[PDB]
Amino acid sequence: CGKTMLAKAVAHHTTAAFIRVVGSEFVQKYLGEGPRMVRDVFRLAKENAPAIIFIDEIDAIATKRFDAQT
Amino acid sequence: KLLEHKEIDGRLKELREQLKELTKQYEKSENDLKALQSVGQIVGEVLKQLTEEKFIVKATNGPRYVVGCRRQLDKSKLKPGTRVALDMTTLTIMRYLPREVDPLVYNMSHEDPGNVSYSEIGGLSEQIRELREVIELPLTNPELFQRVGIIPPKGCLLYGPPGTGKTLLARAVASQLDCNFLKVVSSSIVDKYIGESARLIREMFNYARDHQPCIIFMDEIDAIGGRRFSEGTSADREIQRTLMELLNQMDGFDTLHRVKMIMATNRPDTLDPALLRPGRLDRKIHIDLPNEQARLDILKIHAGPITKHGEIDYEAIVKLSDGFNGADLRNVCTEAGMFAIRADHDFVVQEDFMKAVRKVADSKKLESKLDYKPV
Amino acid sequence: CTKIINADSEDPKYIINVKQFAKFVVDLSDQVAPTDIEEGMRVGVDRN
Amino acid sequence: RTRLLDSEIKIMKSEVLRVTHELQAMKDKIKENSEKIKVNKTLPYLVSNVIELLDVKCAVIKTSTRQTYFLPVIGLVDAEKLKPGDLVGVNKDSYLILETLPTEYDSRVKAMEVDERPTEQYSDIGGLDKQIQELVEAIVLPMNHKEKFENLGIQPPKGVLMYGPPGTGKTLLARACAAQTKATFLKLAGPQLVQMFIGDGAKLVRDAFALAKEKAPSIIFIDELDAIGTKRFDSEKAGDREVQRTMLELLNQLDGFQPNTQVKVIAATNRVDILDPALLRSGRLDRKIEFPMPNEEARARIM
Numbered sequence A: 001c002g003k004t005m006l007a008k009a010v011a012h013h014t015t016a017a018f019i020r021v022v023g024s025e026f027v028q029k030y031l032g033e034g035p036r037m038v039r040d041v042f043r044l045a046k047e048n049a050p051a052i053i054f055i056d057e058i059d060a061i062a063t064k065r066f067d068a069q070t
Numbered sequence B: 001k002l003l004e005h006k007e008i009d010g011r012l013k014e015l016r017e018q019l020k021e022l023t024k025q026y027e028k029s030e031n032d033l034k035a036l037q038s039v040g041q042i043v044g045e046v047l048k049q050l051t052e053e054k055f056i057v058k059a060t061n062g063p064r065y066v067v068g069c070r071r072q073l074d075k076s077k078l079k080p081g082t083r084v085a086l087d088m089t090t091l092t093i094m095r096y097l098p099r100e101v102d103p104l105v106y107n108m109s110h111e112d113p114g115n116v117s118y119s120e121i122g123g124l125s126e127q128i129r130e131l132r133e134v135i136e137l138p139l140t141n142p143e144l145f146q147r148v149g150i151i152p153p154k155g156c157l158l159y160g161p162p163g164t165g166k167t168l169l170a171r172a173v174a175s176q177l178d179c180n181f182l183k184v185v186s187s188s189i190v191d192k193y194i195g196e197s198a199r200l201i202r203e204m205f206n207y208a209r210d211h212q213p214c215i216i217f218m219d220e221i222d223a224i225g226g227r228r229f230s231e232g233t234s235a236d237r238e239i240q241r242t243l244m245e246l247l248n249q250m251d252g253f254d255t256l257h258r259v260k261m262i263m264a265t266n267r268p269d270t271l272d273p274a275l276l277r278p279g280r281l282d283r284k285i286h287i288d289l290p291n292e293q294a295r296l297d298i299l300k301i302h303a304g305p306i307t308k309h310g311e312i313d314y315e316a317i318v319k320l321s322d323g324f325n326g327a328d329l330r331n332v333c334t335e336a337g338m339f340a341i342r343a344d345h346d347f348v349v350q351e352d353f354m355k356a357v358r359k360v361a362d363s364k365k366l367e368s369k370l371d372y373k374p375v
Numbered sequence C: 001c002t003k004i005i006n007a008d009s010e011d012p013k014y015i016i017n018v019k020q021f022a023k024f025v026v027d028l029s030d031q032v033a034p035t036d037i038e039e040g041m042r043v044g045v046d047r048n
Numbered sequence D: 001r002t003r004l005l006d007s008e009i010k011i012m013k014s015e016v017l018r019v020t021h022e023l024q025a026m027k028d029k030i031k032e033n034s035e036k037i038k039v040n041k042t043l044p045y046l047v048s049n050v051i052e053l054l055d056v057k058c059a060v061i062k063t064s065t066r067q068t069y070f071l072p073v074i075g076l077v078d079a080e081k082l083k084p085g086d087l088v089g090v091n092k093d094s095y096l097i098l099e100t101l102p103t104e105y106d107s108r109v110k111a112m113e114v115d116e117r118p119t120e121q122y123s124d125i126g127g128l129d130k131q132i133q134e135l136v137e138a139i140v141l142p143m144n145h146k147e148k149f150e151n152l153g154i155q156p157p158k159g160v161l162m163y164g165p166p167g168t169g170k171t172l173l174a175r176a177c178a179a180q181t182k183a184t185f186l187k188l189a190g191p192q193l194v195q196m197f198i199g200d201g202a203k204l205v206r207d208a209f210a211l212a213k214e215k216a217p218s219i220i221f222i223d224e225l226d227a228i229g230t231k232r233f234d235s236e237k238a239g240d241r242e243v244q245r246t247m248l249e250l251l252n253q254l255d256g257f258q259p260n261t262q263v264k265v266i267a268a269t270n271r272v273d274i275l276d277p278a279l280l281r282s283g284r285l286d287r288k289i290e291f292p293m294p295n296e297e298a299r300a301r302i303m
């Protein structure tokens, strides 16, 4: 329904900084890389400018239940 | 004199006999002595430029590091985004390297053993032309599209009953270029590790962007497709994650140019509408059960290697055939052949075909008969 | 502990899994005859 | 004859000098195999999967302990036989390749081929001449008379399934055809390819059929496929899907891309309507054979 092109248009038309990442790269081969992957991008957003960060596919990262044994 | 010259020539030949062995000995000695200092083995990736001599790198195992360079490595060429080699002990950059090949992609890069042409296939030629409209015409003649001012279609999918000419096209289309063709079973991608399916398909798409003419192919996508889940099991998590990420990799913040996705599945009734979307997958192509003239042409194609006396009405087999696959006719030919191979008949009598049709008929009396139309 | 993976010709040079640590080929030792090695078995194997 | 005598003296001197140079070269080879054995007698060989072959001649590997690596000097192994995707032994200290491993097959895949070779004969089977005869011509004749098919010229029939009520007897025919062929025979349990390490069953499928490809005279039999052949379906919030990957890779690797006529799949089940139509399609398995009930004389023969 145009959910991507809205982000495309506001990223093309913004004056301040903007950043994006595909919403699945927060899982990595080794342990604990993902917390770094979110903390550093938040830190860069803080450091850089009055910027805007875009996150997509939260269902890849936000579910309802969990199995803390896998 | 002559004997002396013969002795001199033989001695020179004996001396030069070990010359290749001496060259191999020197090469192996140099290889071992260099291997004493060829230990500079570990691979990392650079992050950012602190100074011209201060750099930050990340190992492919774990932690990041701070590393410098020797003074003849073109430090301006070390942009953020390139792979590099490291020392262990001093942990220093020795050499920038180009992008990796990730040999899983290599395993289906150019391994194609098929060489079948469009003569071997038949009965669906207008669908072949329809596929050629997106797979061949814009790659060689893109100019008409910007004359009419629209982007050529991004990809297409195929569907139909099982065994009804898809991969014939796919092993028939695969016999055209053999260099821009990558082709996966939609099953080797998944792995017991954490998230490496996403990594491998990421570098797969990166390889597709590396060589601008490339045709990707995933068949039996049901194994990755599904509809969705509300977390029954736990494997659904990362396989759906791989799916979602594949979607954002095919139409997210990128001009996927000169890369075409042709799909194949047995039943599209179990696919995500996100994957089914016309913006995502442009044209859906159905392959039906072959028609009577199509069945005729198919069995005539499978009437290539036949030895017999020709008194055969192909129309009789065609008329008795109804609802038959694009492949079971070749089985019918084979099974009349095994009628010939018993009772020592090098030829095939005309009758053995029709009973073979009867022989296949009851064999498909146990079918499921599910159309499974796309939604 | 260890895990046997595959045999080899002539001199022993068997392939050993640990559990997930490493997957590599050695000859272990010589104090027993090389006939007790079959795939699907666990030997007490050192690290060096 | 002074020139001839001078030529003979020069020939003798050149022969002596060549003998001395060859002796020095042989001593150099002695130091060579000395250094090669002292870098080779480190029997610990951590293996690695080769990744790429660079040129600016150079190579990339990935070790067993999950570390990517680049080496400029390939080493003792020549690279023309080297192709990416293989696996080779590597020195622990130098991280240099030294040898070449043959293959890599799973241990559970190893422990499938027949070692005891069960002894059965056709006279143990009563009232079942037709089914046994058609199995024999569908299996042994593609194994023993290839030119018989080729002279007329056809592909052999590929894929046999037998079905029927469980008390009917078919397994025994698997043991008999094991007894009769002098070829490699691999056997699978039904759900043996059900692992929760994701895609491990896919690895089992590809490993088993790769080993089957390795033995060119060979036949592959699986008992009780209705565990894996359960029909796929559309549902939300519930539904097994690991068996979908296992069944899909099974069906594809037996029939689909890169068709191959070297192994024959033999497929047992006790019911048919559970089975997914994709595997029983037309040529993914060819001969569907039913076991009839022992009607009146077969019972007496069997007892």
Ligand SMILES: Nc1ncnc2c1ncn2[C@@H]1O[C@H](COP(=O)(O)OP(=O)(O)OP(=O)(O)O)[C@@H](O)[C@H]1O
Pocket (backbone or CB within 6 Å): A001, A002, A003, A004, A005, A006, B279, B280
């Ligand atoms: N106003 C619009 N409404 C619908 N589609 C539009 C509109 N403007 C442009 N499009 C194009 O029509 C198609 C539908 O939108 P698109 O495919 O981008 O889905 P999206 O909603 O943007 O992405 P997603 O649903 O995955 O977040 C695309 O080719 C899009 O670029």
Ligand SMILES: Nc1ncnc2c1ncn2[C@@H]1O[C@H](COP(=O)(O)OP(=O)(O)OP(=O)(O)O)[C@@H](O)[C@H]1O
Pocket (backbone or CB within 6 Å): B120, B121, B122, B123, B124, B161, B162, B163, B164, B165, B166, B167, B168, B169, B171, B266, B290, B298, B301, B325, B326, B327, B330, D255, D256, D257, D283
């Ligand atoms: N239209 C056709 N013309 C000729 N042969 C056909 C046709 N359709 C199917 N076949 C035969 O079907 C067999 C299987 O072909 P292929 O592997 O391409 O299957 P597919 O149609 O892509 O379907 P599936 O992957 O579900 O089996 C081949 O032996 C091929 O000759």
Ligand SMILES: Nc1ncnc2c1ncn2[C@@H]1O[C@H](COP(=O)(O)OP(=O)(O)O)[C@@H](O)[C@H]1O
Pocket (backbone or CB within 6 Å): D124, D125, D126, D166, D167, D168, D169, D170, D171, D172, D268, D269, D270, D302
């Ligand atoms: N001549 C025969 N004909 C039919 N069945 C037999 C005969 N001889 C023995 N049997 C029985 O058939 C069985 C063969 O196993 P089978 O039932 O085919 O396995 P499954 O049920 O797993 O397919 C044996 O256990 C045996 O008791």
